[PDB]
Design a binder for this molecule. Structure first.
Ligand SMILES: Nc1ncnc2c1ncn2[C@@H]1O[C@H](COP(=O)(O)OP(=O)(O)O)[C@@H](O)[C@H]1O
Ligand SMILES: [Zn+2]
Lengths: 48, 364, 106, 199, 60
């Protein structure tokens, strides 16, 4: 995961680099709070 | 006027004020089309297999044979022409102008700043010669052809630093208001072996694509510094770049509507092949300003500054021998700075006198 | 007055309809501008009233006859953007990543 | 200084594929104290290990399935398809939601409760069975309310997404729901949802 | 797909006979048309070992 894009509970999207694959700006799943997500941690994400 | 006070008390806003929303109607309008477009591959046409089948290579991807759209200029589908491809049916959608190097783009989009021919100072004969040799082919080629001469390819502008070659070329571009390629030679030499000549090729290909363009290659002594066989790798790569420039300049592919300006401080080290005509037909000695040229420089650069009472160019000219252009402008600059030492809102003769004194001292 | 009041009623009804038309447009624009945009470096902007060419992070160059759903003036050739993952138009602009060594110094 | 070095090139192959997104039929709840979530008709509690309460308190909240109706009785459950029916269940309240979160078709049966007695029969995990219960289904205010007595009040409300299906007359459908197979820890459960309509 | 099977289960709940034809629109180049129609197999039918569909002719 990369820059938080300054969410403040209204822009929770982050751009994430999936390895040698592309990078996408995405949002969170309901099961994770933003406090658990921060720049530079490995995150498991869905595929579509 | 019973219910016709101004207009029913409602239509004044019901007609236009709320009708501002219709402008947003226009806004979302673009959006609808902005959502029915699907985007397109970009590739380069490799070959014309037949009147319909085009061998086209997508960038960083596979290559295909693809047909073109029903209405298109197949004559302009030359090999190497960057094109777009429908992502689904994979057909030639529309041609694109040749991809430009980011370096060439950056060198191509610096604003000349509309500097006027008034703002040069004492270059009348040389500025007239340069105006001739560059601009006249861009005005009346019929004049030259009835005379019978081929319009000049370009010219060299040699002189000591600070003599205004960069500003002179910038002014030429501003008067022309054409595509300007302000290029400094020292910025194109690279450790990557084949990249400098590639950059020169990209520069000249951009120039050919965007006629009328002006190629201003500053500090050309950093490229065309004579060819010799000592054999060190660096100067050898420099010779390779120089000969790439020579080909791009007076090579097999004849040049049309592209004129070049090359400024240097050491004209004597230029390569004889580059020095030869056909490439640099004119050598213009933009030399140190003379006394008349000096006073012209002061009077022209004296414009923006506000003068209180009396300011004489002649004394500054006598006290500033050996000055060349920018340094004279320096005299003005710190003068305004001098104006803040004693907190004025203007300038005085003593201000300018001590300013030119400090400039001369710094020049020592 | 009478014909002018009729014009007033006509214009207010067309506004009343166009409000919900705008609401529907916004609904469908959110329907298509969902969220999982794909990052891409805008290679440059060309003229046709402007078109773009970008380089997505799936190492693919991509020509756009219309530059998505953002403005079209700043759009630096290198401006990282979030472009839709299927129809490939610039749905949003996002702040630049870094310039390598400029990150090296804090 | 006179470096002038060449350059090699090492490509990195890159590719992936989104699979057939998998529907997870999961229910969530926080009825008394635990955010229990169960996947499922075999039942398996995902999180919220061995329940502080009995399973039965939540067994009644379990689309894609509907009771069997005769030809005389209009099958609002059936003709509400393909969209299905959304219900509000009052025990503690239960609602079924259909969401698109992530790459999983979420058929939530989100559970919620309150007013848990400190010695109520629902938390000591005692359980005999659920005797067959008859739900009287009738329309109150355009909503199909089913009144059922719990034997071991229920005020079910069923609304079809297709808000055009005619409402069946007040009938009495007999539900027989019992926990067929399970474990003592109640983590590997098999449920029974047999129910037939009766006029 | 899994979601396709899911929606088809939803449709079959409406009526046991219900088909889920799908069409490949870019593989349908002039000439051949790439299109098929599938219903389902009940899980209990398959796990019990019985074949999904009885056969009485060569048509199928
Ligand atoms: N005719 C001129 N001759 C010399 N210098 C000038 C002239 N006109 C302006 N300048 C000064 O030269 C500065 C720009 O540098 P310049 O002298 O054009 O580059 P170069 O070193 O190529 O001659 C400007 O700030 C300006 O004050
Ligand atoms: Zn499908």
């Amino acid at each position: 995961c990369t820059k938080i894009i300054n969410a403040d509970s209204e822009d929770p999207k982050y751009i994430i680099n999936v390895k040698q694959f592309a990078k996408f700006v995405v949002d969170l799943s309901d099961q994770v709070a933003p406090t658990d997500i921060e720049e530079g941690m490995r995150v498991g994400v869905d595929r579509n | 006027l019973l219910e016709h006070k101004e207009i029913d008390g409602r239509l004044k806003e019901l007609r236009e004020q709320l009708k501002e929303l219709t402008k947003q109607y226009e806004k979302s309008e673009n959006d609808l089309k902005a959502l029915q477009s699907v985007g397109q591959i970009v590739g380069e046409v490799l070959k014309q297999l037949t009147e319909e089948k085009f061998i086209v290579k997508a960038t960083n991807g596979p290559r295909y044979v693809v047909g073109c759209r029903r209405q298109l200029d197949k004559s302009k589908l030359k090999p190497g022409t960057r094109v777009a491809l429908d992502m689904t049916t994979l057909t030639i959608m529309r041609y694109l102008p040749r991809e430009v190097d980011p370096l060439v783009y950056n060198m191509s989009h610096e604003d000349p700043g509309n500097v006027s021919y008034s703002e040069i100072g004492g270059l009348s004969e040389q500025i007239r010669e340069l105006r001739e040799v560059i601009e006249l082919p861009l005005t009346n080629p019929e004049l030259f052809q009835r005379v019978g001469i081929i319009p000049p390819k370009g010219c060299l502008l040699y002189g000591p630093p600070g003599t205004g070659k960069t500003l002179l070329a910038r002014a030429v571009a501003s008067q022309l208001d054409c595509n300007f390629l302000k290029v400094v030679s020292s910025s194109i030499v690279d450790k990557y072996i084949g990249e400098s000549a590639r950059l020169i090729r990209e520069m000249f290909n951009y120039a050919r694509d965007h006629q009328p363009c002006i190629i201003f290659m500053d500090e050309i002594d950093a490229i065309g510094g004579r060819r010799f066989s000592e054999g060190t790798s660096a100067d050898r790569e420099i010779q390779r770049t120089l000969m790439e420039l020579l080909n791009q300049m007076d090579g097999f592919d004849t040049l049309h509507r592209v004129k070049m300006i090359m400024a240097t401080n050491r004209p004597d080290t230029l390569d004889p092949a580059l020095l030869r005509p056909g490439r640099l037909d004119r050598k213009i000695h933009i030399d140190l300003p003379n006394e008349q040229a000096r006073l012209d420089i002061l009077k022209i650069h004296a414009g923006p500054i506000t003068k209180h009472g009396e300011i004489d160019y002649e004394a500054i000219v006598k006290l500033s021998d050996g000055f060349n252009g920018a340094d004279l402008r320096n005299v003005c600059t710190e003068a305004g700075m001098f104006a803040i030492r004693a907190d004025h809102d203007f300038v005085v003769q003593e201000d300018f006198m001590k300013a030119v004194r400090k400039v001369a001292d710094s020049k020592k | 007055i009478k014909i002018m009041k009729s014009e007033v009623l006509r214009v207010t009804h067309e506004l009343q309809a166009m409000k919900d038309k705008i609401k529907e447009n916004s609904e469908k624009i959110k329907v298509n501008k969902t969220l999982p945009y794909l990052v891409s470096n805008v290679i440059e902007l060309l003229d046709v009233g402007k078109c773009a060419v970008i380089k997505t992070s799936t190492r693919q160059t991509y020509f756009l006859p219309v530059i998505g759903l953002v403005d079209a003036e700043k759009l630096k050739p290198g401006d990282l953007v979030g472009v839709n993952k299927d129809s490939y138009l610039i749905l949003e602009t996002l702040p630049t990543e870094y310039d390598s060594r400029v990150k090296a110094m804090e | 200084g006179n470096l002038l070095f060449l350059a090699c090139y090492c490509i990195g192959g890159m590719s992936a594929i989104k699979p057939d997104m998998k529907i997870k039929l999961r229910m969530e709840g926080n009825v008394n104290g635990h955010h229990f979530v169960i996947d499922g008709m075999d039942l398996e509690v995902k999180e919220g290990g061995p329940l502080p309460f009995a399973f039965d308190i939540l067994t009644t909240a379990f689309n894609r399935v509907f009771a069997k109706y005769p030809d005389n009785i209009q099958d609002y459950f059936k003709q509400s398809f393909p969209k299905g029916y959304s219900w509000e269940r009052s025990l503690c309240n239960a609602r079924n939601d259909i969401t698109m979160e992530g790459d999983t078709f979420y058929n939530k049966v989100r559970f919620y409760g309150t007013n848990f007695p400190a010695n109520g029969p629902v938390m000591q995990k005692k359980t005999l069975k659920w005797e067959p219960s008859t739900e009287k289904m009738y329309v109150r205010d355009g909503v199909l309310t089913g009144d059922i007595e719990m034997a071991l009040d229920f005020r079910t409300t069923y609304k079809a997404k297709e808000k055009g299906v005619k409402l069946p007359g007040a009938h009495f459908v007999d539900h027989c729901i019992e926990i067929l197979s399970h474990d003592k820890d109640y983590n590997k459960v098999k449920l029974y949802e047999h129910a037939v309509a009766h006029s | 797909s899994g979601v396709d099977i899911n929606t088809q289960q939803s449709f079959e709940a409406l009526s046991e006979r219900a088909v889920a034809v799908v069409v490949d629109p870019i593989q349908s180049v002039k000439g051949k048309v790439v299109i098929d129609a599938f219903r389902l197999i009940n899980a209990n039918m398959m796990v019990l070992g019985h074949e999904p569909r009885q056969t009485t002719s060569n048509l199928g």
